[PDB]
Amino acid sequence: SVANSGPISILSYCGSSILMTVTNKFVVNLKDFNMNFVMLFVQSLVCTITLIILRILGFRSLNKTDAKNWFPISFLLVLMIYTSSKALQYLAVPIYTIFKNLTIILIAYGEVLFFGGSVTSMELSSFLLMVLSSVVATWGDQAVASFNPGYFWMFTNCITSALFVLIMRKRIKLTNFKDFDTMFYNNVLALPILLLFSFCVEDWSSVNLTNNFSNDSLTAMIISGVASVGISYCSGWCVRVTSSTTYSMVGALNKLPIALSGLIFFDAPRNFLSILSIFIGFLSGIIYAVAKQKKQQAQ
């Protein structure tokens, strides 16, 4: 419709990402959770409950042909989170961001194998400025046994992150899936996969978990669940109206203003290299915006 198109999705995805970040560190802080998949299962329950309440007050659709075709997308999503968490267990945050910025390039070249586009030299220049940014951020920061665990799990996160955004955006365009339908299938079908994943990788010790996962944590999972409502709708909107590359680019660009806020609002020590990485990352988004503007007038 009127507002379901163009850069509105980007601005909305950004705002929803900002709201989710401030809620997780100010409202529902100290969320160093022992049962992350259970937390995401409650987050996906809140999103489903909101969707059903909003449908009976006005949207979306329920099926079984679309369900068996959407199941790999939902499986890829849960596996993407699993490989990401396992990669971050052994790998450092600035290092994780390098490979996460490297996925943008294979998502860009992967979209040429899925939709038949072309990665213009200017888009390729921006992706390189995004890698440069993540590298100078790591550069400005402080054994074979420790090497291989983190790197293997990062390689698997790279392929799952790519396949997920590429296959999801393919099915949406194939089954004329509007935003609210995409949000629904992603959260409804995730519910069993999130449960099955938690049983295989998390501890379920009765009394030792009842005192930790009490009324306080339950309230916190619901509040973080309410915060995730926007971003879950917006990510599925972003991929659809723009592209899988633009979504992963906007996602990488979003980390910069929250990092700049830490430098502005909080009296904390920093090096010039970490400050430089933020502005290199900005130049990447600026020239990526021009690259898209160039495509319109050249196609």
Ligand X SMILES: CCCCCCCC/C=C\CCCCCCCC(=O)OC[C@H](O)CO
Residue 115 is encoded by which pair of tokens? 């939709």
Residue 41 or 96 with smaller CB distance to ligand X: 96
105 vs 82: CA distance, rounded Å: 22
DSSP state letters, 65-96: HHHHHHHHHHHHHHHHHHHHHHHHHHS-HHHH
Q: Is 109 annotated as a binding residue?
A: no
To the nearest whole angstrom, how small is the minimum distance from the Cβ of residue 290 to ligand X? 7
Considering only 28-36, 166-174, 202-210, 261-269, which stretch makes contact with ligand X by CB under 6 A?
A: 261-269
Q: Kindly report the number of other CB atoms within 10 A of residue 57's CB atom.
A: 7
Q: Is 29 annotated as a binding residue?
A: no
What is the separation, in whole angstroms, between the first and last Cα of the chain?
A: 25
Q: Does 280 help bind ligand X (rule: CB under 6 A)?
A: yes
Please give the residues from 162 up to 181 whose contact with a second copy meets the rule CB under 8 A: none
Per-residue CA distances from 130 to 127, 245, 247 (Å): 5, 13, 14
Q: Is 44 annotated as a binding residue?
A: no
Residue with tokens 């420790």: 146
241 vs 4: CA distance, rounded Å: 8
Residue (of 140, 138, 147) closest to 102 by Cα position:
138
Q: Provide the mask over 192-211, with x wherever binding to ligand X is found by CB under 6 A and - wherever it is not.
A: --------xx----------
Residue (of 176, 169, 186) closest to 115 by Cα position:
169
Residue 75 or 233 with smaller CB distance to ligand X: 75
Q: Provide the mask over 46-85, with x wherever binding to ligand X is found by CB under 6 A and - wherever it is not.
A: ----------------------------------------
H-run or E-run covering 226: helix 215-241
Please give the residues from 100 up to 139 whose contact with a second copy meets the rule CB under 8 A: 120-122, 124-125, 128-129, 131-132, 135-136, 138-139
101 vs 227: CA distance, rounded Å: 25
To the nearest whole angstrom, how small is the minimum distance from the Cβ of residue 242 to a second copy? 20
Q: Which residues are annotated as a binding site for GDP-alpha-D-mannose?
A: 245-257
Interface residue list for a second copy (CB under 8 A)? 120-122, 124-125, 128-129, 131-132, 135-136, 138-139, 291
For binding to ligand X (CB under 6 A), which residues are involved?
14, 18, 22, 95, 98, 105, 119, 121-122, 124, 131-132, 136, 156, 200-201, 257-258, 261-262, 265-266, 268, 280, 287
